[PDB]
Amino acid sequence: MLLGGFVPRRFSQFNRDPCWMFFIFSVGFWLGEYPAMMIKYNARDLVYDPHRYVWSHHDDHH
Amino acid sequence: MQGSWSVLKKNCSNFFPGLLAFAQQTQEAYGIWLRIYNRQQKYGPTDFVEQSETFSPDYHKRFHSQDKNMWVDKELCTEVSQKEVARLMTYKLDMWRMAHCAGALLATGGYAIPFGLFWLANDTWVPSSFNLTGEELRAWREAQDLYRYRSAPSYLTDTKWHFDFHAYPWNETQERAWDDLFEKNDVRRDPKVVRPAAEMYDGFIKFELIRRKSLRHLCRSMNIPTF
Amino acid sequence: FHFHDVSNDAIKGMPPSEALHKHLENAQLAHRICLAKALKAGEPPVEKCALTWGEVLIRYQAWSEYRPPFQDSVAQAKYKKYWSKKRQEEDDKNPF
Amino acid sequence: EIQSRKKYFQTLGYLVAFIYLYFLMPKEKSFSGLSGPDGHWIMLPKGRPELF
Amino acid sequence: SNPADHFRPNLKALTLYAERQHYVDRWLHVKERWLAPWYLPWWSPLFQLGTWYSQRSRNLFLVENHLSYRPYKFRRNDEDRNNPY
Amino acid sequence: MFLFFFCDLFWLRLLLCMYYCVWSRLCFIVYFNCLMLIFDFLLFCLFDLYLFVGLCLFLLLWFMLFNLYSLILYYCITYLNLYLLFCIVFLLYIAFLFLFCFLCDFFLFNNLLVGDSFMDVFFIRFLLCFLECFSLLCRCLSTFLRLFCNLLSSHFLLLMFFDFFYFIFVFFFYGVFCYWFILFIFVFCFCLLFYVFLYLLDLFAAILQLFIFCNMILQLIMDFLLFLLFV
Amino acid sequence: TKYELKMQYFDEWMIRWRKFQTESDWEIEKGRQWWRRFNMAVSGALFCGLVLYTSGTATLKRQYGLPHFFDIGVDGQAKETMLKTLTSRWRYTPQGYGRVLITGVPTYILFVTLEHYRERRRMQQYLQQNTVFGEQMRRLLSTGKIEEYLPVNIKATLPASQQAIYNY
Amino acid sequence: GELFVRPKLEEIPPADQCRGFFGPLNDSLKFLRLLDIKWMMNRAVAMRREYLIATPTLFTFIWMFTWKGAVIYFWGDRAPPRRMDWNTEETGRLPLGFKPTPAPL
Amino acid sequence: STVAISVQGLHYVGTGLAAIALAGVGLGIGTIFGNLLVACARQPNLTKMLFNYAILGFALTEAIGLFALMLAFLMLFS
Amino acid sequence: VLFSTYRSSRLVSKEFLHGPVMRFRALGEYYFQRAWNGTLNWALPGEYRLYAVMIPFIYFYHRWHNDHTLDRDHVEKAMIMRWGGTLEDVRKLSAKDQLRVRCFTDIEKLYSAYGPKDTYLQPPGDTLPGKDFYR
Amino acid sequence: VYTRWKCDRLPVFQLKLFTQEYPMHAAVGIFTIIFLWKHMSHCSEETERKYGWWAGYPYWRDPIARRNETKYKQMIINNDVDITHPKWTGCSVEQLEELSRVV
Amino acid sequence: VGNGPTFSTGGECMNTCDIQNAFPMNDRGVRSSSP
Ligand SMILES: CCCCCCCCCCCCCCCCCC(=O)OC[C@H](COP(=O)([O-])OCC(O)COP(=O)([O-])OC[C@@H](COC(=O)CCCCCCCCCCCCCCCCC)OC(=O)CCCCCCCCCCCCCCCCC)OC(=O)CCCCCCCCCCCCCCCCC
Ligand SMILES: CCCCCCCCCCCCCCCCCC(=O)OC[C@H](COP(=O)([O-])OCC(O)COP(=O)([O-])OC[C@@H](COC(=O)CCCCCCCCCCCCCCCCC)OC(=O)CCCCCCCCCCCCCCCCC)OC(=O)CCCCCCCCCCCCCCCCC
Ligand SMILES: CCCCCCCCCCCCCCCCCC(=O)OC[C@H](COP(=O)([O-])OCC(O)COP(=O)([O-])OC[C@@H](COC(=O)CCCCCCCCCCCCCCCCC)OC(=O)CCCCCCCCCCCCCCCCC)OC(=O)CCCCCCCCCCCCCCCCC
Ligand SMILES: CCCCCCCCCCCCCCCCCC(=O)OC[C@H](COP(=O)([O-])OCC(O)COP(=O)([O-])OC[C@@H](COC(=O)CCCCCCCCCCCCCCCCC)OC(=O)CCCCCCCCCCCCCCCCC)OC(=O)CCCCCCCCCCCCCCCCC
Ligand SMILES: CCCCCCCCCCCCCCCCCC(=O)OC[C@H](COP(=O)([O-])OCC(O)COP(=O)([O-])OC[C@@H](COC(=O)CCCCCCCCCCCCCCCCC)OC(=O)CCCCCCCCCCCCCCCCC)OC(=O)CCCCCCCCCCCCCCCCC
Ligand SMILES: CCCCCCCCCCCCCCCCCC(=O)OC[C@H](COP(=O)([O-])OCC[N+](C)(C)C)OC(=O)CCCCCCCCCCCCCCCCC
Ligand SMILES: CCCCCCCC/C=C/CCCCCCCC(=O)OC[C@H](COP(=O)(O)OCCN)OC(=O)CCCCCCC/C=C/CCCCCCCC
Ligand SMILES: CCCCCCCCCCCCO[C@@H]1O[C@H](CO)[C@@H](O[C@H]2O[C@H](CO)[C@@H](O)[C@H](O)[C@H]2O)[C@H](O)[C@H]1O
């Protein structure tokens, strides 16, 4: 119902409560998984599967 | 009252004597009821004898009317004595419970035997005739009183809550009567002060409009089988 | 031996009883062929002919359930009522 | 008191169930067949030669 | 397609199969075992509740005389509209 | 065929056990109208008009545990099937309808014959009666269909938008370092705004649809209730 | 004797092997259906009669009194005749469980007895049949078990175009 | 909506006032009242017995929406085919030379 | 003769037709807001009830908009 | 007589596991039994910290389950179909090759309906194996 | 004072709730359950192949075939079924031996 | 003072609830959260 509870005023206060500490850790995970995906899936050495045209989900579900 | 092994032994020991006593009481009560029914049919009012129909104003469902479908035989003393009437009432209770049990037996064949064991282990639904001594009768009466204690408060609360949440008394005297009607038994209620509540509830709900849940609670409180 | 044709095109113009009997016969033929191969190899039949036996079983179940309707007063009345000259002619003058 | 004890036991049981479901239980009918059952028939007849 | 695949239960654990004939026969055996004893007369409401409706349904099935064909309930393939067999 | 699976509420069941081992007041109810059917005093009903409260509360709780938490990614609405919702609505609607019919009061249906004596009985009143008796079942069907399809459509849209957001965020963030960074920033701000808007809309609609799912049943009940006046 | 427990297996087998249902067995089943309908009709008539007899005097007066929906004249005459017939003599008019028992127990007993004896009659009919179903019924009553695939074991008659399977 | 009170015996109009499909079925036509459905509907409306029109309808719908709907869908007989596979009445009879088991005795 | 044909690009056509349903949705929202302004002009004090009812209806019109959008995506991505 | 229908027929002592139960109730009551924790139909509490804690946990365990149990099936199917159509054929590859294939599958998942269609549509003249490579 | 929810144990309260509080709902629920298990409790092999698998039917091992094989083997072994009987094969044992020698 | 809870309020403002009269009012004019 969103009635009350501890509300940090800014980022620096998220360490003033264990629940908000876990929340900021989770937010860090959420936002930091994106740069990791950028680096991993846009890497120079990444190569498409040579057999990618052998089979695809499009033919399977069709 | 919860079942017990001692009560089970008591009822098992007195099962056949109890049945014989019940049969004798059945004959006597049939005679008494025959007398009463003949008197009612002969001298009863036309509405009572013809079973006049009274329908509710909302869903037009028939139910007994207190004024028309109930008649007091002022001259019943000539044919039937007070003790006979009390005997008939007690036998009516016992016969109701025995009839329910017999119906269950007939319906379920031989599969009611364990349920019969559960039945004999408790004095709540056994006939009074199963008690052959004063102590057994006292325990049976205690069981009946326990059932009444279990059931009555629910009926009282149902009535009071429904009325108080859907209506209010008209005048101060009715307010006092309503408030004092539902006092605990520890205090003594003056019938004169409480009587106007009867008229007030007649204005709210008569016996012909009694709801099925309230009826079930009342039957529970009167030791009348409901299933 | 010869397997009957139970394709959709062949089945389209066939009575249900004939199709069921043909499927049953095909299943029996396949089962006996598998049994003959197993006997020639000398291996136990149960370890090789289970699926064919099950197919024969299911075809038997499907074949024994169907009883063609008896031609009687009410059945003929229904058939004539539904299939009037109008409807039969319209079908005759229609695709498929 | 009764409800506290019952809910303590229920909470422990639900915790165990949650762990098993979301971290140990394999999904049935896997494509590779490495995890989970593919299903099987039950209530099959036994000792009834006349049935066939 | 791929978005549509996201609306499936995510905690499927086991699947069991059983032919209708087998478990129907087992249920009939159980019912006969429980309704056989002498202390349950045939005229009792319980016995009639157990037997009469089933008898009526089976009789209705037997009397059935349909001009159309009803494909077998438990075929291997029922996804083909142009192949009732 | 017998499939063994489990609902997606085990953690929520654990939380309910942990937090509700002790009593707590409830003051905010999604559908409050099931507790206040009569607004004019001195009106009372002999029918069990408060029988729907328990079912209403349980249904609200169950559907809220499922739908509201389904916004969280990868959360599964285990009951999301058209015919399952049909079964639920059938149970509730037909149970109340059979409660009214078992009353064996035929006069209760007099209002079905719409209109007055001045209108042709066979060609006007009777047709409208047929249409209304059809409309009852249509109301049942409409309730179940609306409940199913609102959820399905909202979650389809959320999945599609999230896929687009992931695609652009992952494969086009490098534009921040390029000369066209402004376009990417504009697109990213637009996507964030749309993300917030979609989440708010889904949160509000999930609760509104339950209001309406319970309101349809309460309307069915009210269509056959008659109130007496105290005297 | 409990014929239903024996007959359920036979009925299920016949449904599974309905292909070999001769027209005689079909006629037997149709007669069983007709007798079930007749039993229902007679039980309903008995129930209606018991209900009418035990009905209260005021209830009868309201039901069989004015007004007349059609007012043809025959309707009123019949209603008056029935009302006079019912109200002339004294009738036991119980209410509550008593009326329920009086109206139902006779009806239930009649229906159950008729249906049980008709089931026995159908069992006898199937016993007297000279078809594969009759042989199956006799074997069931003798050995106590249903022998599935019996028609193909004893080579029951088949259409001229379906005798190849028996060719062994 | 509001409470319904049955009309008194004196408040019920006479049968002769009722109208049928074409016109009133008065003397010399009373027996036609049984066959005229519209006349019966008008009579019921006049006598405030409107339930006779509504109760059979609603119940019917329910009966269709609950029990007969699925029965027809799952076990109903579809239209017969053009070429009909009638029964030759050859199946079932025991073969020649077969010795059936004796009946119970 | 029996001929079976499988046209690929037709799914695009059905997608566009469903999108047309939004025309009756976007307009419906404008109608609600159009009435809202008039109502607020002649009952300024009772702005709370009017604004809430406007947003409640906007969700009961957006639902129908979501109804069509789902079919469009189904016929566009499948 | 065999079993009591009343909850008052205790099966254990009042002090059985008192300490652990009290600790459990202490955990339950500290954050929930508060004035500002006014629930909406028992489902949506008023405490912000409850959301802040539970939403991440629910997402984490759901995502772990999805990644390690649900999507794994699709990944394995793709690996099997694209590299021989049998599990042993896939196992004939090295761990690095399997990593490459699975990451390409993740690429396809991220692309979905907005990525280039050359990832599954073979352009004419392409020298890479076709669909009938293993047939 | 006595109250069903506070004094009765859970099974008893459940029976009371669904017998004297919501009996019609329980009856309709049982009716619907019976209907579902009588008409919506079967799945053909083709249906399972089309939709019965999360990622698709693995034709490269055909688990359905193995399942049916195990079923039929168990049935044959337990019930002592002679699969070589003429009814199963449609031909006599001697004809079967002749065919085996031929092929 | 301890950190224990009190009579539950359900997040309701007793100065505007439908049963406000059941909650006593103090000198400051703020109705109590408990009887
Ligand atoms: C074998 C076949 C079986 C078939 C299946 C049966 C399945 C079981 C169902 C139940 C059957 C009955 C069971 C026995 C009950 C005992 C007899 C009795 O009625 O007691 C009076 C008593 C009457 O109650 P009441 O409320 O006082 O009556 C108000 C009336 O106004 C009362 O009127 P009143 O105020 O004017 O006072 C009159 C009173 C005045 O009398 C007295 O006061 C004297 C006492 C008389 C009654 C004594 C009863 C004694 C009971 C105990 C018996 C011993 C048990 C021993 C057990 C241990 C054994 C080892 O006398 C009466 O009570 C007479 C009542 C009217 C007669 C009812 C009997 C009709 C059926 C019998 C005839 C059948 C003919 C078949 C013909 C076939 C043709 C083809 O019975 C009851 O308590 C009612 C029954 C309670 C259980 C109900 C269960 C549900 C029943 C649903 C049935 C639906 C129809 C059937 C189909 C079912 C499908 C699901
Ligand atoms: C020889 C004798 C003389 C001759 C015979 C005479 C005639 C005798 C018969 C007539 C007797 C009538 C009076 C009876 C009074 C006693 C009634 C009673 O039971 O009282 C409660 C009685 C105790 O009474 P009490 O302590 O005196 O307390 C009484 C109070 O006043 C408390 O009172 P209350 O009011 O609070 O209690 C009432 C409570 C009564 O209920 C209970 O209290 C529940 C009792 C059971 C509780 C079970 C709890 C334990 C569960 C264990 C589960 C398994 C655990 C694991 C086992 C592992 C084993 C290896 O609730 C009800 O009344 C509910 C009624 C529900 C009616 C249901 C109707 C359904 C109709 C269906 C719909 C139809 C619609 C129409 C459709 C039409 C379609 C055409 O309960 C017990 O004793 C519990 C027994 C538990 C036994 C063990 C568990 C079950 C074992 C099953 C074995 C199965 C073997 C075969 C398996 C085969 C598998 C293939
Ligand atoms: C052949 C392979 C095996 C399988 C055989 C299956 C046979 C099937 C026969 C044919 C059936 C045909 C029809 C099937 C229809 C299915 C429909 C369906 O599933 O719909 C979905 C639907 C999903 O429901 P749901 O929303 O998920 O909620 C149900 C949940 O149970 C949660 O709902 P709830 O929380 O409201 O439930 C109440 C809950 C209230 O909360 C709790 O009580 C908390 C605990 C919850 C437990 C239940 C959840 C299970 C979670 C997953 C499994 C947990 C880990 C198992 C580890 C296994 C490791 C191999 O209380 C309970 O559950 C009471 C049980 C508590 C047990 C506690 C045991 C403690 C033992 C301690 C021993 C200590 C020893 C010390 C020794 C020291 C020596 C020094 O399922 C159901 O509604 C139930 C379907 C059940 C149908 C009956 C099946 C027949 C019975 C099978 C029993 C097999 C036992 C043998 C297994 C042996 C291991 C392999
Ligand atoms: C109070 C209730 C409140 C709650 C209600 C809740 C429900 C809501 C309402 C809507 C319903 C929802 C549906 C829910 C599911 C329920 C189950 C369901 O649908 O199952 C259907 C389902 C239908 O069967 P099916 O398997 O689907 O397929 C049909 C098969 O043929 C099946 O084969 P079968 O062998 O079972 O056959 C059954 C047979 C029905 O029963 C039978 O087997 C035969 C008929 C039995 C008659 C019963 C007695 C009738 C009255 C006798 C007289 C009494 C007065 C005595 C005094 C007279 C003094 C003169 O049905 C038929 O097939 C039709 C037979 C037609 C015979 C008449 C032939 C036409 C010409 C003759 C009449 C026209 C004459 C005018 C000529 C022109 C003059 C100008 O099962 C049944 O219900 C049938 C079996 C049970 C029949 C019981 C028979 C007794 C009926 C007594 C009713 C009395 C009260 C009614 C009036 C009330 C006035 C106030
Ligand atoms: C294992 C066993 C299985 C058993 C299955 C059978 C069913 C269950 C059996 C019984 C279960 C026990 C409980 C039953 C309910 C008890 C109700 C109650 O407490 O009543 C108290 C009440 C006593 O209170 P009272 O103060 O003395 O009088 C009541 C007041 O009048 C009240 O005053 P009011 O102001 O309330 O007045 C209104 C009152 C006025 O009514 C009455 O109270 C009078 C009594 C009832 C009269 C019923 C007949 C009306 C005329 C029928 C005409 C039919 C003509 C058809 C012609 C066809 C020609 C082809 O009610 C009505 O207006 C209702 C009229 C009935 C409407 C029926 C609508 C049916 C719609 C069907 C829809 C479609 C169905 C499917 C399709 C079918 C076709 C294909 O009892 C009675 O009056 C009679 C009770 C009768 C109980 C039922 C007896 C059952 C017998 C079963 C025999 C067959 C067994 C088969 C077994 C099969 C193998 C297992
Ligand atoms: C890909 C294809 C998709 C197709 C989708 C189609 C829609 C599917 C929707 C499913 C979900 C929603 C279900 C809602 C509920 C539907 C209910 C329904 O129609 O079921 C009817 C069905 C019909 O039953 P039935 O199918 O067994 O009918 C038998 C009829 N014969 C024998 C002629 C074939 O009911 C049941 O399944 C329950 C039956 C048992 C319970 C009732 C017993 C009492 C019956 C009383 C009358 C008869 C006996 C005499 C009186 C009593 C004597 C004791
Ligand atoms: C009724 C049995 C009749 C025949 C005698 C069988 C005796 C078997 C030996 C039992 C020895 C252990 C007994 C331990 C005490 C049991 C107490 C008991 O039954 O309490 C039930 C109690 C629950 O009670 P409440 O509902 O909370 O309230 C009860 C107060 N009304 O149940 C339990 O907790 C389960 C206890 C199980 C104990 C073992 C029972 C074994 C019964 C077997 C019967 C079958 C015949 C055995 C023959 C054995 C021959 C060597
Ligand atoms: C308490 C009542 C006791 C009754 C005891 C017996 C009374 C005397 C016999 C009554 C008449 C029996 O005669 C009965 O006639 C009908 C035809 O009308 C036959 O019925 C035959 O033709 C009808 C025609 O519609 C078919 O539906 C039915 O399938 C077929 O069997 C019955 O098979 C036969 O049994």
Does F118 contact ligand 3 (Cβ within 6 A)?
Answer: no
**Do the Cβ atoms of L33 and L12 come closer than 8 Å?**
no
CA of I68 to the centre of ligand 3 (A): 41
Please give, rounded to a whole number of angstroms, the shortest distance from the CA of C38 to a CA of chain G: 21
Instruction: Tell which residue, L27, L34, L35, has the closest CA to residue L8.
Output: L34
- Which residues, in sequence order, are bridge partners of residue F3? E15
> Helix (H, G, I), strand (E, B), or coil: what is residue I61?
helix
Q: How far is CA B140 from CA B6, B10, B145, in A?
A: 13, 11, 9
Q: Which amino acid is at I5?
A: I
Q: Measuring from atom 65 of ligand 1, which residue has the nearest CA? A: G98
- Which residues, in sequence order, are bridge partners of residue F229? F43
Q: Which two tokens stand for residue J33?
A: 């039994």
Please give, one letter per residue, the 3-state secondary structure of K48-71: HHHHCCCCCCCCCCCHHHHHHHHH
Strands F43-44 and F228-229: antiparallel
**Do the Cβ atoms of D37 and E14 come closer than 8 Å?**
yes
Chain-centroid distance, C-alpha H89 = 35
Q: Which two tokens stand for residue D24?
A: 């140990």
> Helix (H, G, I), strand (E, B), or coil: what is residue L3?
coil
Which helix H or strand E contains F43, and what residues bound it? strand F43-44
Per-residue DSSP letter, C36: H
CA of G25 to the centre of ligand 8 (A): 16
* A-proximal residues of F, 68-107, CB under 8 Å: none
- In order, the DSSP letters of C64-85 are HH--PPP--HHHHHHHHHHS-H
Instruction: Tell which residue, L2, F17, L11, has the closest CA to residue J33.
Output: L11
Please give, rounded to a whole number of angstroms, the shortest distance from the CA of F70 to a CA of chain J: 10
CA of A46 to the centre of ligand 3 (A): 46
**Do the Cβ atoms of J117 and A58 come closer than 8 Å?**
no
What span, in angstroms and rounded, lies between the C-alpha atoms of F116 and F107?
A: 16
What span, in angstroms and rounded, lies between the C-alpha atoms of I35 and B214?
A: 51
Q: Which of D25, D39, D43 sits opposite E15 (nearest CB)?
A: D39
- In order, the DSSP letters of G145-166 are S--TTHHHHTT----GGG-STT
What span, in angstroms and rounded, lies between the C-alpha atoms of G141 and G133?
A: 12
- Which residues, in sequence order, are bridge partners of residue F43? F229
Chain-centroid distance, C-alpha B163 = 23
What span, in angstroms and rounded, lies between the C-alpha atoms of G73 and G75?
A: 5
Q: Which of G18, G116, G119 sits opposite E62 (nearest CB)?
A: G18
Q: Which atom of ligand 8 is nearest to G110's Cα?
A: 1
Which of B2, B124, B154 is the best substitution to test chain K (most K C-beta atoms within 10 A)?
B154
Does B61 contact ligand 5 (Cβ within 6 A)?
Answer: yes
Counts of helices then strands in chain F (DSSP H, E) = 5, 3
| Among G46, G97, G113, residue to substitute to test ligand 1 (most atoms within 8 Å of Cβ) | G97
Contact F117 H1 (CB under 8 A): no
What span, in angstroms and rounded, lies between the C-alpha atoms of G85 and G78?
A: 10
> Helix (H, G, I), strand (E, B), or coil: what is residue B138?
helix
Q: Report the phi/psi class of residue E45: left, alpha or beta, with left for phi > 0 and alpha for psi in -120 to 50.
A: alpha
Please give, one letter per residue, the 3-state secondary structure of G50-64: HHHHHCCHHHHHHHC
Q: How many CB atoms lie within 10 A of CB I30?
A: 10
Q: Which two tokens stand for residue K61?
A: 């091992």
What span, in angstroms and rounded, lies between the C-alpha atoms of H11 and B136?
A: 64
Q: Which two tokens stand for residue I23?
A: 């025309």
Chain-centroid distance, C-alpha F213 = 3
Sequence-separated (6 or more) residues with CB below 8 Å from residue J109: J71
Chain D: residue whose CA lies nearest to J10 = D2
Sequence-separated (6 or more) residues with CB below 8 Å from residue J130: A53, A54, J122
Does K12 contact ligand 2 (Cβ within 6 A)?
Answer: yes
Please give, rounded to a whole number of angstroms, the shortest distance from the CA of H2 to a CA of chain B: 9
Method: cryo-EM
The residue behind tokens 């049942």 is: F140
Which helix H or strand E contains J7, and what residues bound it? none
Q: Which of F97, F117, F126 sits opposite H53 (nearest CB)?
A: F126
**Do the Cβ atoms of G52 and G59 come closer than 8 Å?**
no
**Do the Cβ atoms of K40 and F87 come closer than 8 Å?**
no
**Do the Cβ atoms of I72 and I18 come closer than 8 Å?**
yes
Instruction: Tell which residue, J54, J56, J76, has the closest CA to residue J64.
Output: J56
- Where does chain D show beta strands of DSSP type E? 40-41
Ligand (nearest to CA of D13) = 3
Q: Is I42 annotated as a binding residue?
A: yes
Q: Which two tokens stand for residue G109?
A: 């007993």
Sequence-separated (6 or more) residues with CB below 8 Å from residue L24: L31, L32, L35
Contact K25 F95 (CB under 8 A): yes
Contact L9 J39 (CB under 8 A): no
Does G51 contact ligand 5 (Cβ within 6 A)?
Answer: yes
First to last CA, chain I: 30
What span, in angstroms and rounded, lies between the C-alpha atoms of K45 and F1?
A: 11
> Helix (H, G, I), strand (E, B), or coil: what is residue F44?
strand
Q: How many CB atoms lie within 10 A of CB C84?
A: 10
Contact F18 D11 (CB under 8 A): yes
> Helix (H, G, I), strand (E, B), or coil: what is residue H12?
coil
My answer on whether omega of the bond before G67 falls inside 30° of 0, hence cis, is yes
Chain-centroid distance, C-alpha B178 = 24
Instruction: Tell which residue, F86, F79, F35, F80, has the closest CA to residue F57.
Output: F35
Does F171 contact ligand 3 (Cβ within 6 A)?
Answer: no
Q: Which two tokens stand for residue B216?
A: 């079930």
What span, in angstroms and rounded, lies between the C-alpha atoms of F164 and F168?
A: 6
Q: Which amino acid is at I73?
A: F
Q: Which two tokens stand for residue K21?
A: 């509080």
Which of F39, F227, F228, F229 is the best substitution to test chain B (most B C-beta atoms within 10 A)?
F228
Q: Measuring from atom 29 of ligand 3, which residue has the nearest CA? A: F6
What span, in angstroms and rounded, lies between the C-alpha atoms of J43 and J41?
A: 5
What span, in angstroms and rounded, lies between the C-alpha atoms of H9 and G68?
A: 10
Does K47 contact ligand 6 (Cβ within 6 A)?
Answer: no
Resolution of this entry, Å: 3.5
Q: List alpha helices for chain E, DSSP H.
A: 20-35, 45-63
Which helix H or strand E contains F156, and what residues bound it? helix F126-171
What span, in angstroms and rounded, lies between the C-alpha atoms of F56 and F59?
A: 5
Strands D40-41 and E12-17: parallel
**Do the Cβ atoms of A49 and J82 come closer than 8 Å?**
yes
Q: Which residues of G touch B99 (CB under 8 A)?
A: 97
| Among G26, G29, G34, G118, residue to substitute to test ligand 8 (most atoms within 8 Å of Cβ) | G34
Instruction: Tell which residue, H31, H13, H9, has the closest CA to residue G73.
Output: H31
Instruction: Tell which residue, F114, B64, D4, has the closest CA to residue J19.
Output: D4
Task: Provide the b/e sequence for K65-90 (b: ≥16 CB within 10 Å).
Answer: eebbbebbbbbbeebebebbebbbbb
Instruction: Tell which residue, A15, H83, F105, has the closest CA to residue E67.
Output: H83
What span, in angstroms and rounded, lies between the C-alpha atoms of F45 and F217?
A: 18
CA of H67 to the centre of ligand 5 (A): 20
Task: Provide the b/e sequence for B146-160 (b: ≥16 CB within 10 Å).
Answer: ebeebbbebbeebbe
What span, in angstroms and rounded, lies between the C-alpha atoms of G102 and G87?
A: 19
Answer whether C touches B (≥3 Cβ pairs < 8 Å): no
What span, in angstroms and rounded, lies between the C-alpha atoms of L17 and F27?
A: 10
Degrees, nearest 5: CA angle I32-I36-I37: 130
Which helix H or strand E contains B31, and what residues bound it? helix B15-43
Ligand (nearest to CA of G46) = 4
Instruction: Tell which residue, I74, J75, I15, has the closest CA to residue E1.
Output: I74
CA of D41 to the centre of ligand 3 (A): 20
Chain J: residue whose CA lies nearest to K57 = J77
Q: What are phi and psi of B85, to 5 degrees?
A: -65, -45
| Among E43, E52, E55, E56, residue to substitute to test ligand 5 (most atoms within 8 Å of Cβ) | E52
- HSE-CB of G134 using CA atoms within 13 angstroms: 23
